[PDB]
Amino acid sequence: TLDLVNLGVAANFAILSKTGITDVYKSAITGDVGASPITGAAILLKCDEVTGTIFSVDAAGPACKITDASRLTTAVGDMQIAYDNAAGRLNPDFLNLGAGTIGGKTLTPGLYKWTSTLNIPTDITISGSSTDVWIFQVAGNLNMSSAVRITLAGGAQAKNIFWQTAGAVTLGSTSHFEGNILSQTGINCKTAASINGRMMAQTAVTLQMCTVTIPQ
């Protein structure tokens, strides 16, 4: 059975990036947000958008920000370890499933690999027990189209799902995502996209009136 990706301190964040967090007001974030090593000024969230703590490396950032460089250093470090752990898993259960387009699929537990961009143009289901683990390894971009919903079935939980992407993630407007995103690059959410899962970007997270909730 497939081991969890250990996020270490990064587990405490709904959104963690390296070059900031942009926003089209109003978004709804539940969980802590942070960015390092970029200045807190690069977090463009207001205080009324975040239920949780906004962490900054410095004296800049939103009014409510807490300055904690040392915690953000560990979190981003942990996020990179998680990214490398997820990317490094061997012996996939699936390689190039749906030739890189997986709309309408029900995904069962295990390790999936794509040597391409992964596209999700229509609704999918992720189906398994409360303790089953999914790791999706994507060597290109990850695209989910407008209005596309990931459904969890069988007791599958968002905290047991990891999406590792070598390229940028693009969540289409009104889309509903489930799981942790470990992006080597950006995570770009469009108007009124929901994410039940963490957005861990080694560049930036961009929001457009999005809802982000840390998985429970």
Numbering used by the authors: 61 to 276
Paper text:
The FfIBP from Flavobacterium frigoris PS1 exhibits high TH activity and relatively strong recrystallization inhibition activity. The FfIBP structure is composed of parallel β-strands in a helical pattern, which is mainly stabilized by inner hydrophobic interactions and intramolecular hydrogen bonds with long α415. Additionally, the FfIBP has a capping head region that consists of two small turns and β-strands, which contain a disulfide bond. This disulfide bond increases the overall rigidity of the protein and reduces residual movement at the ice-binding site, thereby augmenting TH activity and protein stability.
